[PDB]
RNA sequence: AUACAGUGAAACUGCGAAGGCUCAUUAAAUCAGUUAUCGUUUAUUUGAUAGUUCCAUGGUAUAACUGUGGUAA
RNA sequence: GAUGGUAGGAUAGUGGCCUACCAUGGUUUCAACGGGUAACGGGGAAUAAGGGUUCGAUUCCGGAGAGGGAGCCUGAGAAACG
């Protein structure tokens, strides 16, 4: 990154003349570090004191939370099809916040054989999902700044208001 | 070339001014770590084995151990360029760096005859081998100390209580 | 003695592993050879020194002297890059993951433009020097090198382009697109002369070709997928080809060949995680070079038998072969000590 | 009402109240309208002061660009010079804001380069 | 469409390089004779 | 370099005193230095005034505090052990940092403006003051701007007086700073000049802030007791 | 004072320097006050503030130091 | 990026601060935007002096620089006079 400051661009008056000044230390923009799937390695950076930031790049073990208990379980990451904050992003297949990436939901298949009895009151759209195993859920923690990858399932209502986008 | 020579057991070591260059032509070629015979370097000791362990060239540079290279190279070392030789051992050595770690057929009377003791014996306990009274003070300040804060948080959060009853 | 790989009949060595007593009888070739966890993309350039290789995280440029054994510089660029070139000796050319290009000299960083649309790819013209940018859509750039203009984007099919080469005896400009179709561009016409269909036998998925390539005979072309499926092309009866299934197949990325050292009518393939190398005329494999970790891409150094690879650990794996040709003159005592 | 992906939504139908006298209207405590930095519901704050005015414009959406004439006692020429001032606003769901319309606005968190305020009031 | 695709003339580039005249090792007319079909 | 409240004399010197971080802000306070040396003249030099601060005579807020430049805001009461000197300082008419003399049953105690109440962690009520003395437990109807009464001994608060309409306040801000009164008006506003307005020797009017203003006592009775002339 | 015991060159340590010249001409954007940050960082100052235990004390690896040396340095 | 909206990135966080997508906005005769110096002078920036009435106390002219641009590092605080 660069900057934050409004020093080297308009305002909403379109004024000119700028050539302000060297830009400081507290404009720091540090480098765009998308997130991607391969093996976890967290960077450790250093800001404002001994304030350490976790900046992820690699990223696997997802916590992601079954919506209607709530029940953030460890799983895997296979890819995001549909995240127009940048449409190339999901060509290059990386991991932000926001974004809608596929699960092999086999633990919870785990916890729902294990707290139910049987195997298949659920959605249906979702329950061929705990048929066949990937199910989407979009990822809440921001791996760029907390260096984490946790998540919410799609179950239903959000499942076809994104089903419905791509 | 010179020939730095050490026994480290014993606790010997010694320079040795060897001329006459096809006697140190085994030497050539081989880079750290790599040992070598004391038959073609010389006759009078025989059966002997050094592994080498660097060695300053002339104009004083150094060696690091297994790089590649032998001639000099500007490297990054303890993060500045810092000029080194490299670890294979040519013909532009001053002193070269040897361990002896089988004397072979001859006594010498500088390395194996004579030899120097340790410095000085242990001084940890278990170096030596191989405080109760702060462990009461301890456990009592800490038993204390929590006699002391977590009845005292109660003992106020009772007097909120009291506040919530009279509210 | 460093440690060897058991292959077919054939001998490999690694420097620079993630194993790679052991402390005391290093066998360190190129001294911070180590990035920030990962690596981009490394290549070497065409005098006898001088290798470039792509950062990772605060990603850098990286260049190392061969003929001192360690690096020069490391220029933290603005943005994470995806592909460049080199163009001699100082000067080269990038482009990052976002649609901006940066030109890198001596003193670094000679100035930053822009591309409309996202970019996958970069390839420079020798002749006239124009830079062919492959990107996203209906979109294939020129930024001239001759007076800094733009030229009258070549209109291509509707997805866009994963890799975009021009051939080098004669120029005849690649463009591997998505919907099969190789879209060969004239770069003396600015016009197309054929788009060429690429088949099979298995058919998983309509795959996209992501890697292209030609030699300097300037007869033949080399194809890839996004499947492990390499392919060979001439003009004799150019509807059909030769194909290479790859045991794993993901996404071939590298295609190279060995048209400048001896043993010749080889070539060198490249997914995900294995890259091997076969003969012409057959499809039969010389090698494999089977490494502890996935490959971003690879690189093989000209005249002598090693290979450079960018990977996903934190150092670059080197890649020796000593029946495909010796060890050069910079790394001349590797055939002494293996 | 939903015309843009990422699970539109508030974020922890929602309702709240800033106090300080400024009413909240029945749909904005309980309606279909996502309320996102609409201060009833709101993911902001209230703090600092609150000025008042008439608009100019509310071209686009959630831009209200209001007037604010304002008395100044003039010692230089010893005539009061007409005072005007602009600032944009973000919508709210209680008053589609035309010509005229005196309202009033209180000051919170920077939301785009330039507001800091948000409508609170319609009389 | 503000920044995207600026059809201007750069100061820095304009001279970057130099072209080659004979370039291809190859004629025209070994083009046209190599790709008639 | 210095500033009014002080009551410090032109000839003095060129380097000011800055006090150090305390309590108080740096405006709103004065040191030991200014206060001991130049001001009730215990001390004539800095060296002399160290030398009685490592003897430790000062028992501002019944704490020792052995500092040059401690900031003694508003109505810390300074307790020196020799001649048991008990002085609380606070504003006289005209900016400056009035130090009144008071005696013991008046300095075991202090006052202070809440500022905010808080439901911190673990369900703890929460109170704090100018000196930002964080006592444990008071009522819930502790509003802002009302005023705690501090033990001095421990730390808890013993006496509560409700900021309304029809208390005694002093007001600390602003071109009304230090002024005593409290009725002809009260006007709360929604954001600024919002107060409760203060007479005069004639009942003559003012306007400040809620927070240059905090209570001290009734119509009448304050159990401070303040200097005359 | 036969495991330490005072002077103390040279080495680790705690800190010191805790704010100094020249050059091209910015119109409340340089500056001064003020509102706010439940919109934020904070060493030091000050007030507060910790409850998971199956069949008498834990490991080599480096200095300083000795010893052999290289280099004009 | 002109003006705003939605999301992400980066942030110490607010923020078109940067990027994807979308809308064609916004300031102005109630002075936009632009023109220069006794802008080595001015603005209280401040002390005022018991008769000097724009001399007469000071903070700051603007930002930079440690040979020249570039990149990186340290720290509660830095794009370090070391």
Known sequence: GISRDSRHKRSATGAKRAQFRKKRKFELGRQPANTKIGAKRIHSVRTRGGNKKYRALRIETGNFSWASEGISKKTRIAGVVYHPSNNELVRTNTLTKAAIVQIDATPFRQWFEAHYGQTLKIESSVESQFSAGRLYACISSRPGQSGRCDGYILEGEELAFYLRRL | MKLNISYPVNGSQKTFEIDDEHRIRVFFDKRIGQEVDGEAVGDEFKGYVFKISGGNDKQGFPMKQGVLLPTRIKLLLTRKRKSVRGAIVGPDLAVLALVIVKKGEQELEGLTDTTVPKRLGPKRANNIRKRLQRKRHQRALKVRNAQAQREAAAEYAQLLAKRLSER | VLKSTSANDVSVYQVSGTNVLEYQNRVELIQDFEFSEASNKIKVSRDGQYCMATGTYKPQIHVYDFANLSLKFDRHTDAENVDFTILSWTKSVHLQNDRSIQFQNKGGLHYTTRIPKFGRSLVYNKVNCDLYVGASGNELYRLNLEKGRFLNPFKLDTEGVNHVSINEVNGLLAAGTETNVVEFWDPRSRSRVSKLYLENNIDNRPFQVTTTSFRNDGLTFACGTSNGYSYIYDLRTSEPSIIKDQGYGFDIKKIIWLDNVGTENKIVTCDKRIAKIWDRLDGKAYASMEPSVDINDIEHVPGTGMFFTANESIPMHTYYIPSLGPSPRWCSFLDSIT | QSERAFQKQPHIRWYKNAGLGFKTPKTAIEGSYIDKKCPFTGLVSIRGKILTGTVVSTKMHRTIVIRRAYLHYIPKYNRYEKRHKNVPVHVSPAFRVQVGDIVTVGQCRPISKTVRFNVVKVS | KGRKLNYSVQDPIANYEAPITSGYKWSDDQIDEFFAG | AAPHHWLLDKLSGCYAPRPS?????????????????????????????????????????????????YPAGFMDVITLDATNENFRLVYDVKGRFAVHRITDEEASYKLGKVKKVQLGKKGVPYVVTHDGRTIRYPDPNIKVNDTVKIDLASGKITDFIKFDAGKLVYVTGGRNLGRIGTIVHKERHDGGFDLVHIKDSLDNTFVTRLNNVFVIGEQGKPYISLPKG
Do not use: C
């Open chain 6, 21 to 69: 971080a305390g309590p108080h802000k740096l405006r709103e306070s004065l040191p030991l230095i200014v206060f001991l040396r130049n001001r009730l003249k215990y001390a004539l030099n800095g060296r002399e005034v160290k030398a009685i601060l490592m003897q430790r005579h000062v028992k501002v807020d019944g704490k020792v505090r052995t500092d040059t430049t």
